[PDB]
Coordinates of C-alpha atoms in Angstrom, one line a residue:
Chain Q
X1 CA 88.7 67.6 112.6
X2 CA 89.6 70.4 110.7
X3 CA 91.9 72.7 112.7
X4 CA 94.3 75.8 112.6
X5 CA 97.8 73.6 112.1
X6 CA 95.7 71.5 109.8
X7 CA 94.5 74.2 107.3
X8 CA 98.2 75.9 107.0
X9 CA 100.5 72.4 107.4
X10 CA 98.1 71.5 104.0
X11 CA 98.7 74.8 102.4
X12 CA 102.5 74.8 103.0
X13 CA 102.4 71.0 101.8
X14 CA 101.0 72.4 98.3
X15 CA 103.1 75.3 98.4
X16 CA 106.4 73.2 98.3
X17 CA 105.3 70.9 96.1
X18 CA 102.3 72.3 93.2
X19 CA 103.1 75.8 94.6
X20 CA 101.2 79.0 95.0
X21 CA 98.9 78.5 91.4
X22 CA 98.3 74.9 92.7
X23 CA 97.3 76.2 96.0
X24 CA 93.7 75.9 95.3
X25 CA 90.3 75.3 96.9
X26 CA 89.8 71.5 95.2
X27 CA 93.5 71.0 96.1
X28 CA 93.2 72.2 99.9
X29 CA 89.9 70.5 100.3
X30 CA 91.5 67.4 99.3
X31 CA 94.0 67.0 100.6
X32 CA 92.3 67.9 104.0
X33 CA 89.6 65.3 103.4
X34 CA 86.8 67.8 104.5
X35 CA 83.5 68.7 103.0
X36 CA 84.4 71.9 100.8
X37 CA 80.7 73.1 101.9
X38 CA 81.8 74.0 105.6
X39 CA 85.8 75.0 105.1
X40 CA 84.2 78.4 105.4
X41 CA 84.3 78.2 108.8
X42 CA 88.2 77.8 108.8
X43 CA 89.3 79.6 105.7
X44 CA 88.8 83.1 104.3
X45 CA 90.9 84.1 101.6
X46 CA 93.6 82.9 99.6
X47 CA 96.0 86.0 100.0
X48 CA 95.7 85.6 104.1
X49 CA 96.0 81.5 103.8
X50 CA 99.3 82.6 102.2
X51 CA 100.0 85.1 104.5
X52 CA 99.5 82.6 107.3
X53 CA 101.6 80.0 106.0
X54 CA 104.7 82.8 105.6
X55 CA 103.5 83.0 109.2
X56 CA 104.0 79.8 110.0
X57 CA 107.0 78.8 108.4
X58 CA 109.0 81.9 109.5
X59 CA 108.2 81.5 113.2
X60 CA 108.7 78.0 113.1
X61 CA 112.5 78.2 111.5
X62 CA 113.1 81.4 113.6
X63 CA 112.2 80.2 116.8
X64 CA 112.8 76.4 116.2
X65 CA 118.3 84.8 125.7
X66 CA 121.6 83.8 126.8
X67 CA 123.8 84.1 123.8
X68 CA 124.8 88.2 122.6
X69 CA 122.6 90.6 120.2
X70 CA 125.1 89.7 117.7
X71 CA 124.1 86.1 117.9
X72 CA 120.9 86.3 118.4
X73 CA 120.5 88.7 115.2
X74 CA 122.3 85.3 113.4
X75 CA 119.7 82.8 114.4
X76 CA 117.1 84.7 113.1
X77 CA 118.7 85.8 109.7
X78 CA 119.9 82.1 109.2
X79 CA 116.5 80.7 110.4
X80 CA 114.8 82.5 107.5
X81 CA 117.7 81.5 105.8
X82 CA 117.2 78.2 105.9
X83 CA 113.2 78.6 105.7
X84 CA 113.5 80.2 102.2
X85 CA 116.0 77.3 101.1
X86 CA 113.6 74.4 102.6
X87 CA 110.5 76.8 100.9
X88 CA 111.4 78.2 97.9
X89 CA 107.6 80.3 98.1
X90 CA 108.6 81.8 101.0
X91 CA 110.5 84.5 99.0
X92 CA 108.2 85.8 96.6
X93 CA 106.0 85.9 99.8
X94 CA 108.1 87.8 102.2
X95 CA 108.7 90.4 99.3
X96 CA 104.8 90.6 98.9
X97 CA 104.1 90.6 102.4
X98 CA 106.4 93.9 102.9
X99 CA 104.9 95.8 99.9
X100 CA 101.4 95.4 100.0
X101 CA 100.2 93.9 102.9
X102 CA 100.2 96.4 105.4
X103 CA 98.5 94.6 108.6
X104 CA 101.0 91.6 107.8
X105 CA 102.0 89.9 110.5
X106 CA 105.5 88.4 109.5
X107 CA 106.8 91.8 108.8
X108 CA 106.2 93.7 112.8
X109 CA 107.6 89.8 113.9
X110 CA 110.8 90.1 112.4
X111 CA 110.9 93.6 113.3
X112 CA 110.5 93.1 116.7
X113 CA 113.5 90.2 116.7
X114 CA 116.2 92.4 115.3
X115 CA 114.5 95.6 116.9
X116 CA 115.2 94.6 120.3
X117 CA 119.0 93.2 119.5
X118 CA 119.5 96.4 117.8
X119 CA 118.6 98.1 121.6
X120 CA 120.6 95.3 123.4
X121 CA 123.6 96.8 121.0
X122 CA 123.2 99.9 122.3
X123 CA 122.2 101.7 119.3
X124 CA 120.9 105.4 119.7
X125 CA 116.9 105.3 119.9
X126 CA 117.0 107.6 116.5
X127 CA 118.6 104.7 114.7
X128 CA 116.7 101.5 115.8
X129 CA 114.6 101.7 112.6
X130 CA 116.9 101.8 110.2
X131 CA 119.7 100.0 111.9
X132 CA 116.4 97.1 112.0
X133 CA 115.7 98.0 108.1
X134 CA 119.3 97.2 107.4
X135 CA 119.5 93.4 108.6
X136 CA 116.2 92.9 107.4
X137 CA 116.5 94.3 103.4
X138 CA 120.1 92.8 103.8
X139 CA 118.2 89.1 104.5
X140 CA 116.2 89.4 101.9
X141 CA 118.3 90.4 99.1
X142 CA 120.8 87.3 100.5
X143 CA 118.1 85.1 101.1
X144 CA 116.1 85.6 98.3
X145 CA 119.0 85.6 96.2
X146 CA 120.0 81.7 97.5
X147 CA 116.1 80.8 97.1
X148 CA 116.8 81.6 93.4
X149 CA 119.6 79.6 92.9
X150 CA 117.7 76.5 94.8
X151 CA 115.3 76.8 91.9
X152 CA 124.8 72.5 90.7
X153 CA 125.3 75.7 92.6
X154 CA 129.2 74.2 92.6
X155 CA 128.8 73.6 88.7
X156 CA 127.2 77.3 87.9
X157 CA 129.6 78.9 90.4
X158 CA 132.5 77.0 88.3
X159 CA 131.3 78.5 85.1
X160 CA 131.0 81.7 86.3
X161 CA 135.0 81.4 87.4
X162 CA 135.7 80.1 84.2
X163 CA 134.0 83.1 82.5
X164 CA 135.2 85.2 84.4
X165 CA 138.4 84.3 84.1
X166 CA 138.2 85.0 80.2
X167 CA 137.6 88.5 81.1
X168 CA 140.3 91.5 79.6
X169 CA 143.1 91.6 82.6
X170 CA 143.5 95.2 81.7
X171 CA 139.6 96.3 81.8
X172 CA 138.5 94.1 84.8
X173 CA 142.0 94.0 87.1
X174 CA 139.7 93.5 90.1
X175 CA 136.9 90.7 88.7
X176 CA 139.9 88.9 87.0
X177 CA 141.9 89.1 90.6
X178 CA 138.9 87.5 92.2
X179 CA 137.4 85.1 89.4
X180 CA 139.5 82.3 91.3
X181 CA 137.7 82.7 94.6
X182 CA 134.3 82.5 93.0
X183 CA 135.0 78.9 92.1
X184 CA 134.9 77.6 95.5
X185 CA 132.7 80.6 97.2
X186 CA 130.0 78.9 99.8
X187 CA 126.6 80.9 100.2
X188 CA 125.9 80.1 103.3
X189 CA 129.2 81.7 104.9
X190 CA 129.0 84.5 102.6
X191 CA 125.6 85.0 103.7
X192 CA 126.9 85.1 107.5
X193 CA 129.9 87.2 106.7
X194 CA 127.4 89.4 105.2
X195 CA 125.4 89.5 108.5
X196 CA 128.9 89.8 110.5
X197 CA 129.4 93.1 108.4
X198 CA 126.6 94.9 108.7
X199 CA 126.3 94.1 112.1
X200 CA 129.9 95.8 112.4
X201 CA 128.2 98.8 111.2
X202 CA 125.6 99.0 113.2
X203 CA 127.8 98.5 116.3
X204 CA 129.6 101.3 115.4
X205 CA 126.9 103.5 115.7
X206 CA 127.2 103.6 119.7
X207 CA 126.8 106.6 121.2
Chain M
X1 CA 118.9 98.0 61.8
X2 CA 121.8 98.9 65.1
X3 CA 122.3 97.4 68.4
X4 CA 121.1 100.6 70.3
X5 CA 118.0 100.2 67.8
X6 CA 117.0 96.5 69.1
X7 CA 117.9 96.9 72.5
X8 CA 116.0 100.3 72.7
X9 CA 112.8 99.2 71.8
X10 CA 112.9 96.1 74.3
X11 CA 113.1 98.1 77.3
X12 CA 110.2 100.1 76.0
X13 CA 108.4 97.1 75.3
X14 CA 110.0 95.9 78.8
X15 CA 108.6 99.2 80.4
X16 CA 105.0 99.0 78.8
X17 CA 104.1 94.8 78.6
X18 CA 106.4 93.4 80.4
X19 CA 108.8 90.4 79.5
X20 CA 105.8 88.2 78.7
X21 CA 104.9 91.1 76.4
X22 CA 108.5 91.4 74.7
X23 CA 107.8 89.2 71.5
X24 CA 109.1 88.6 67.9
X25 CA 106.4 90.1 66.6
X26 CA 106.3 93.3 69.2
X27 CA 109.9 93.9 68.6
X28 CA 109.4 93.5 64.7
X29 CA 106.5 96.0 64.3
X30 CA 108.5 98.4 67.0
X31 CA 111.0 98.2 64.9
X32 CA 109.5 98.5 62.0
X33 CA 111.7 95.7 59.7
X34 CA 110.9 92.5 58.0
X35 CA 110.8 89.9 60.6
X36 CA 112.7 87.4 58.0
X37 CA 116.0 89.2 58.3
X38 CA 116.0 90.5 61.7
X39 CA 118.0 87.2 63.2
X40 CA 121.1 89.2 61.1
X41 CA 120.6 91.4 64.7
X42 CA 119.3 89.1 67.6
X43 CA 119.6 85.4 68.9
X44 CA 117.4 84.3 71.5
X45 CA 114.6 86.1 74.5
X46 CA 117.2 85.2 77.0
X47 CA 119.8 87.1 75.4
X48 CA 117.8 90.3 74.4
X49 CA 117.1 90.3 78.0
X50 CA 120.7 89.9 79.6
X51 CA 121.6 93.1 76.7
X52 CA 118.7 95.1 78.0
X53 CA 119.3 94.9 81.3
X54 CA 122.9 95.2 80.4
X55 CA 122.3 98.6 78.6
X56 CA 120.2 99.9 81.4
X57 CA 122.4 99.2 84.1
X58 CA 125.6 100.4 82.4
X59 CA 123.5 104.5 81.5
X60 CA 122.2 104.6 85.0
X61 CA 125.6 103.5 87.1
X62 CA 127.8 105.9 84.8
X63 CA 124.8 108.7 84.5
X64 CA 125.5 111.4 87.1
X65 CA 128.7 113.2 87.5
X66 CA 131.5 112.4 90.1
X67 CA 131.7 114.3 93.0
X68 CA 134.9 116.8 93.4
X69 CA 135.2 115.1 97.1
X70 CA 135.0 111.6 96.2
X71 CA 135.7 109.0 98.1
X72 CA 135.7 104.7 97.1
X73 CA 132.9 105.4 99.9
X74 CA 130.7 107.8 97.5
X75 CA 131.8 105.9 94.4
X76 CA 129.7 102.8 95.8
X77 CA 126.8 104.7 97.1
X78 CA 126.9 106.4 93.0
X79 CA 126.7 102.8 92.0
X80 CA 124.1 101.8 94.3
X81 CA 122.0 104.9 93.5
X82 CA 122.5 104.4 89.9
X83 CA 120.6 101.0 90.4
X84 CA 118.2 101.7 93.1
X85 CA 116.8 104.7 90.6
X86 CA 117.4 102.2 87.3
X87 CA 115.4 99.7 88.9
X88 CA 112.8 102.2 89.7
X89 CA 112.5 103.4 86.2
X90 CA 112.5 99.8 84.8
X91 CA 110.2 97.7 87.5
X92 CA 111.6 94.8 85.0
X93 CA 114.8 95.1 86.1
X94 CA 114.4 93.6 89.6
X95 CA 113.7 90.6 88.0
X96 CA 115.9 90.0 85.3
X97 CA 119.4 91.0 88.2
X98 CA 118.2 88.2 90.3
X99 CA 117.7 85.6 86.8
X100 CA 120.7 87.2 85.8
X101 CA 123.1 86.5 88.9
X102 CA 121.2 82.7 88.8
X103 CA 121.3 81.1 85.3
X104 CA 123.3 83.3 83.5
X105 CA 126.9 82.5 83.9
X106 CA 128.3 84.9 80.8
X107 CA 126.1 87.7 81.7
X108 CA 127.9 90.8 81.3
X109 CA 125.7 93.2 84.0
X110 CA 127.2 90.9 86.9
X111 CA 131.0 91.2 86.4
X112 CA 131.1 94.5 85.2
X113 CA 128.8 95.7 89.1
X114 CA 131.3 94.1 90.4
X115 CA 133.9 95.2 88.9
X116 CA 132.9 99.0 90.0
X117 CA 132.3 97.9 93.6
X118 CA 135.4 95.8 94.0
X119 CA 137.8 98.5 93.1
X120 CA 136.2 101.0 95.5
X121 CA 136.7 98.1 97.9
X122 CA 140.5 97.8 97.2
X123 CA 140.4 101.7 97.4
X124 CA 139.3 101.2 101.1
X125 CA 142.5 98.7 101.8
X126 CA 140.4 95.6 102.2
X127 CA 142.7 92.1 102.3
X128 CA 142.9 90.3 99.3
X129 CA 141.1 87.8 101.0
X130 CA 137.8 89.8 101.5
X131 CA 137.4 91.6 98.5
X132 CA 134.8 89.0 96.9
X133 CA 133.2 89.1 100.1
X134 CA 132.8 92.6 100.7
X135 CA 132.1 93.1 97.4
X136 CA 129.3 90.6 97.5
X137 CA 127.5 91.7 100.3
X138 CA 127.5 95.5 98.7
X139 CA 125.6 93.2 95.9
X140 CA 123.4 91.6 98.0
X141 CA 122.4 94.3 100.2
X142 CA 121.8 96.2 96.8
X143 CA 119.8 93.8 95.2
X144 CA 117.8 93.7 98.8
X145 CA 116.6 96.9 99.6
X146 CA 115.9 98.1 95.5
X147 CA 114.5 94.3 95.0
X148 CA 112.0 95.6 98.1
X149 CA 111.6 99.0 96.2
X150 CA 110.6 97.6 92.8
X151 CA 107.8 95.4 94.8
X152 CA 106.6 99.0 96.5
X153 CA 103.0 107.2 100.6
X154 CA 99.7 105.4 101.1
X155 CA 101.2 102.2 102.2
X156 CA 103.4 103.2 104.7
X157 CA 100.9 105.7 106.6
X158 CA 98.6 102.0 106.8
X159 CA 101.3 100.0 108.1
X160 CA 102.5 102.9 110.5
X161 CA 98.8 102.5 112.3
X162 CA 98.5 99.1 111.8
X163 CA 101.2 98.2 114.0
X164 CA 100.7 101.1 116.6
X165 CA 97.7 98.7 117.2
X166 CA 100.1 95.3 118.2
X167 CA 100.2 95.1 121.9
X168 CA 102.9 97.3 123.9
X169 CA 103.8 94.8 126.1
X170 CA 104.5 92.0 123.2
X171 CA 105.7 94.5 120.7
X172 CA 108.1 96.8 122.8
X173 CA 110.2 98.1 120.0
X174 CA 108.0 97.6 117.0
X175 CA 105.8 100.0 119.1
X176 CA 108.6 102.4 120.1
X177 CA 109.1 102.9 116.4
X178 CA 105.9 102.4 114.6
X179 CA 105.6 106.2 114.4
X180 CA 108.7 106.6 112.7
X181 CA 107.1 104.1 109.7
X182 CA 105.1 107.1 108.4
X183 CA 107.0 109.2 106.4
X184 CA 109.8 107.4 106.0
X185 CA 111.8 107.6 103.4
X186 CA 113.2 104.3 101.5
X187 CA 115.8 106.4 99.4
X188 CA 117.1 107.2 102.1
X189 CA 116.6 104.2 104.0
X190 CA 118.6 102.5 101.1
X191 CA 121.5 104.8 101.3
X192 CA 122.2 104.5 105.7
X193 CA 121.8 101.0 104.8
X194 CA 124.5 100.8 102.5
X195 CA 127.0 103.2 104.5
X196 CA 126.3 100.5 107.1
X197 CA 127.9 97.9 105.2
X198 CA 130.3 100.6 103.7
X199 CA 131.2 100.8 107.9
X200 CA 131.9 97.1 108.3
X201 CA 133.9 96.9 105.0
X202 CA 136.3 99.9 106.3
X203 CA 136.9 97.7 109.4
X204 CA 138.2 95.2 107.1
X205 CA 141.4 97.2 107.2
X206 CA 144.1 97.0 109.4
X207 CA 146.9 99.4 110.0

C-alpha cells in the first residue's frame, strides 16, 4: 500500500528522470499504481512533496562519531556533494529551500551537522553561526556549481585552458600563469581543498 | 548604433523581463533602429548575454575607490563586494555567472574575476601550486553566498521562530543559535565568510 518511502522514492524517481515540471499528479499517481481519488490521504502539496524529497535525498547521502570535526564537516559537505551530482534537482531545491521556505526542514538539519563540529572545534559561542553559514554557502556555491556542469567536464575544462592560454601575457600575467593547471584541474579535490580551507579559517578563530 | 548602446538596453530589458523577455524585437524597439541592420552590431542571445553580464561585472568590481590601507586582503573582499551588490542590482546575474563558468569556455567575465582574485592571491605569497586553487574557492564561495542572496527581513524573523520550535534535545546547536537568525545580516554574513577563506589562503604561506 501506499506509504511514506513510497510517495517520495516515486517523486525522486520523476525528479531525476522528467524532473520537477514532470513531477505531476498523473505522473505520481502512476507510477504509484494507486487510485488518484484517495492519494489525499498521503499527499498535500507539491512544494512540500519537493521539500520532502530534498529531505530525503540529503539525509540519505549525508548519513549514508569517531573521526575529528574536521572530518566529520567533510562527509557531510561531500555527502551533499555527491547527492547534488547523483540529483541534479537537488540544487535548485536547496537554494529554494534556504530563501523561501522558512519551516524547511533540510536547512536546521544541515545546520545542526556543521553546527555542532563547529563547537567540537572550539569556536567562540559568538561565531557558531557564521562559522556554520560559511561551510554551508561555501557547499552550495561548489556544489551547485558541479551540479551545473553535470547538466566532457575534461573536454570543456581543456577549452577553457586553451582559451585561456590565448589570453595577452602582459594584461592577464596571473590567468595566463595558471591556464595550464586548469587543463587537468579535478572538481572533486578542488571542492575538498575548498572545504580544507575554510575549515583552516574557522580553526583559527579559537579563543 | 554603439556597443554601450546594445548592451545597455539588455540589462534593462534583463532587469525588467528577464532573459526570456530579452528578444529581437524588445531590443529593436528599445533601441529604436531597423531590425534589418542591427546584425552589423550583435550575433547571437548567448553572446549578448555573456557581454551583459560582462559589462556589469567589470562597473561593479572596479566602481568604488581603493582604500589608502589596502591590503591583497581588502582588494578581494572589493571584488567580492563589487559582485555580491552587482548581483543584487541585476537578480539576472546569478544565473548567467553559473551558465557562464559551465558552457561558456571564451567568456570574458570568468578569466578576467579571476584574474583580480589571483593576483591578490600571489600578493599573499601563496605557492605556485595553489594559486588556481585558492583562487577558485574565493570563486566558489562568492558565487555561494551571493547565488543564496539573489534567491532571497520578513523571512528571517519566520525562520528564527520556526526553528526555536525544533526540539532542544535533538537540535542542541540549531537551538543555541536560532535567536541569532533574526536580524542577521547576510552582507555581513558574506563578508566574515570570505575573510574566512581569506584566513586559510594566508596559511598557504610559508616562511
Amino acid at each position: 500500500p501506499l506509504s511514506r518511502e513510497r510517495i517520495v522514492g516515486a517523486a525522486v524517481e520523476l525528479l531525476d528522470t522528467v524532473g520537477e515540471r514532470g513531477l505531476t499528479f498523473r505522473a505520481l499517481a502512476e507510477r504509484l499504481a494507486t487510485g488518484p481519488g484517495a492519494i489525499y490521504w498521503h499527499i498535500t502539496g507539491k512544494a512540500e512533496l519537493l521539500g520532502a524529497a530534498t529531505d530525503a535525498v540529503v539525509t540519505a547521502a549525508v548519513t549514508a562519531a569517531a573521526d575529528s570535526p574536521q572530518d566529520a564537516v567533510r562527509a557531510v559537505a561531500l555527502g551533499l556533494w555527491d547527492a547534488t551530482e547523483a540529483h541534479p534537482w537537488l540544487a535548485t531545491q536547496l537554494a529554494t529551500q534556504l530563501s523561501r521556505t522558512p519551516w524547511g526542514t533540510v536547512a536546521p538539519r544541515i545546520f545542526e551537522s556543521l553546527g555542532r563540529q563547529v563547537q567540537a572545534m572550539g569556536v567562540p559561542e559568538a561565531h557558531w553561526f557564521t562559522a556554520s553559514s560559511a561551510l554551508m554557502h561555501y557547499i552550495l556555491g561548489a556544489a551547485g556549481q558541479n551540479a551545473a556542469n553535470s547538466a566532457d567536464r575534461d573536454e570543456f575544462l581543456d577549452t577553457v585552458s586553451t582559451a585561456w592560454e590565448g589570453l595577452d601575457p602582459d594584461a592577464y600575467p596571473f590567468t595566463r600563469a595558471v591556464a595550464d593547471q586548469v587543463r587537468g584541474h579535478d572538481d572533486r579535490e578542488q571542492f575538498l581543498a575548498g572545504i580544507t580551507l575554510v575549515l583552516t579559517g574557522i580553526t583559527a578563530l579559537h579563543r
